[PDB]
């Protein structure tokens, strides 16, 4: 369970998150049908690196969610170096494959609106890390 | 799109399936297929979740399978109490929930039952509001098809009557209801008003008189 | 006397908006890891997953019933509140409120719910007229007397009848109502007790219709 456990801490750790921020206010990585970590035209090889990858893109949004405190810098540097570690033993069950600057010049062009865009990017952590933990689970 | 059965019969002693048809993106990718009974006028009981896990009570002929995107529901043994609507849930993509239409499960065998009839005369309370009713009461009785005719001393009865249709009982027999809407002066007018039941060609009548 | 409740109405417009609230009690709602749902029930159709709100807060409705329904909460009241827009009568159901045990790692429902009838109708709230239909040893066994109350024109549906204050429920058959030519419901609620026991057990039908906030407690005497 050292990855349900996992999952949940980094989960727990969002939910921690948005409230410290969700208290003044008041195409991201996702899974699909043809990556695999479902049932039904499953092959662990496309999933794995579906979620080191997404983890990855999602591991590089919270450097903006970091130069954006520090009322909760631990908080906010926990659930960076907590994913680290998820993506280290996800890489350890994998076998190598898969850009910071891309989602540079995309989350410009994107951009209490940097909390409305803070709140979808730590939802969609938590929708991809529920997606993650359900694909893992069986296999 | 959970394709179930609209209806199953069972044998009074043992054994049933219940289908629940989906499809890649619902039952497919997950294991969510959850099961629930549901007996009339309350809401589901939860019986099976994770297409095998019995919840926490459920007996252990309540068995749960799945081949493909399609989970079905065993019940070996069947009780005469095992007579619900049996529904079939899954988690479709993403963060939602899709229901069957269900099944009704019919227990099967039980014999002819002949039918209890209670009729009641107008309260003298609804007769000072100017208003006169009469309450024909049919239950525990097996086919549940009857006919119920009312008679203004012998002669016919057609209007003011209302009649409802036969709704299965917990002991699994059928209740049925006939109420009949008169004048004061028509009830007192007349020597007797009369409930006729037929069922399965057997005649049962209460007569009641002001 | 613990339970997961719905709140009324009743009855509702087709123009008008659908404000249902679930009251949560014996757990809190911003627990992990739940989902807490509203599920649907057509008069004699089946069950319709409507929509989630999490431990979170984030919610999640089906694809035909979004922009319609929008699901509300508050901590503080420990409450969940749907909201159904636009309705019309194909939205004429038993609402259920239900708990999710886990929010993700499953979408299965323990704790269900109850249900509060919702039939949606340009039609007015008629309060039922509640007379006392009295034993009649005619038609019971040898030794036993059959007692009722007649719940007469009232809209819509449902009316829940009591015996006793929910004391006396063995040998109790409420009948389902009948549909007149009016549009007004009628139903009988039937006790077979001892034929002896009518000079000294006091009967009292407790009627309650919520839509039109009537309660009548109609004492049954021989």
Not at chain 1, 37 to 66: A, D, H, M, R
Not at chain 1, 109 to 118: E, G, H, R, S
Not at chain 2, 110 to 137: G, H, I, M, W, Y
């Amino acid at each position: 369970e050292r990855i349900d456990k996992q999952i949940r801490y980094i989960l727990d750790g969002i939910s921690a998150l948005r409230k410290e921020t969700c208290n003044k206010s008041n195409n991201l990585p996702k899974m699909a049908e043809k990556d695999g970590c479902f049932q039904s035209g499953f092959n662990e090889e496309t999933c794995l690196v579906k979620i080191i990858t997404g983890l990855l893109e999602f591991e590089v949004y919270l450097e903006y969610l970091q130069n954006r405190f520090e009322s909760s810098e631990e908080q906010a540097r926990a659930v960076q170096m907590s994913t680290k570690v998820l993506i280290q033993f996800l890489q350890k069950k994998a076998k190598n494959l898969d850009d910071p600057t891309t989602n540079a010049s995309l989350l410009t062009k994107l951009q209490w609106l940097q909390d409305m865009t803070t709140h979808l990017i730590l939802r969609s952590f938590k929708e991809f890390l529920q997606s993650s933990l359900r694909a893992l689970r069986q296999m | 799109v959970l394709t179930q059965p609209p209806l199953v019969s069972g044998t009074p002693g043992q054994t049933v399936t219940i289908s629940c048809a989906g499809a890649n993106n619902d039952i497919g990718t997950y294991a969510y297929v959850s099961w629930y009974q549901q007996l009339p006028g309350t809401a589901p009981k939860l019986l099976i979740y994770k297409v095998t896990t019995r919840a926490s009570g459920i007996p252990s002929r309540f068995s749960g399978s799945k081949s493909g995107n399609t989970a079905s529901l065993t019940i070996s043994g069947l009780q005469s109490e095992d007579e619900a609507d049996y529904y079939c849930a899954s988690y479709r993509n993403f963060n939602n929930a899709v229901f069957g239409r269900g099944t009704h499960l019919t227990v099967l065998g039980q014999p002819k039952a002949a039918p209890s009839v209670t009729l009641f005369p107008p309260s003298s309370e609804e007769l000072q509001a100017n208003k006169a009713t009469l309450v024909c009461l049919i239950s525990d009785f097996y086919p549940g098809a009857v006919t119920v005719a009312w008679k203004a001393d012998s002669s016919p009865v057609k209007a003011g009557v209302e009649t409802t249709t036969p709704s299965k009982q917990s002991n699994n027999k059928y209740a049925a209801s006939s109420y009949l809407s008169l004048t004061p002066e028509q009830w007192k007018s007349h020597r007797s008003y009369s409930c006729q039941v037929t069922h399965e060609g057997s005649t049962v009548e209460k007569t009641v008189a002001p | 006397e613990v339970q997961l409740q719905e709140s009324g109405p009743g009855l509702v417009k087709p123009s008008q908006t659908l404000s249902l609230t679930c009251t949560v009690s014996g757990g809190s709602i911003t627990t992990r890891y739940y989902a807490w749902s509203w599920i649907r029930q057509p008069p004699g159709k089946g069950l319709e997953w409507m929509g989630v709100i999490d431990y979170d807060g984030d919610t999640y409705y089906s694809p035909s019933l979004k922009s319609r329904t929008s699901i509300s909460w508050d901590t503080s009241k420990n409450q969940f509140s749907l909201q159904l827009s636009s309705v019309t009568p194909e939205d004429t159901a038993v609402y259920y409120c239900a708990r999710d045990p886990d929010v993700v790692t499953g979408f299965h429902y323990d704790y269900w719910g109850q249900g509060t009838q919702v039939t949606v109708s340009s039609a007015s709230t008629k309060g039922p007229s509640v007379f006392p239909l009295a034993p009649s040893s005619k038609s019971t066994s040898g030794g036993t007397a059959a007692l009722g109350c007649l719940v007469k024109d009232y809209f819509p549906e449902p009316v829940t009848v009591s015996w006793n204050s929910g004391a006396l429920t063995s040998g109790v058959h409420t009948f389902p109502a009948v549909l007149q030519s009016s549009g007004l419901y009628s139903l009988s609620s039937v006790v077979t007790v001892p034929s002896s026991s009518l000079g000294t057990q006091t009967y009292i039908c407790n009627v309650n219709h919520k839509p039109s906030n009537t309660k009548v407690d109609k004492k049954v005497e021989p």
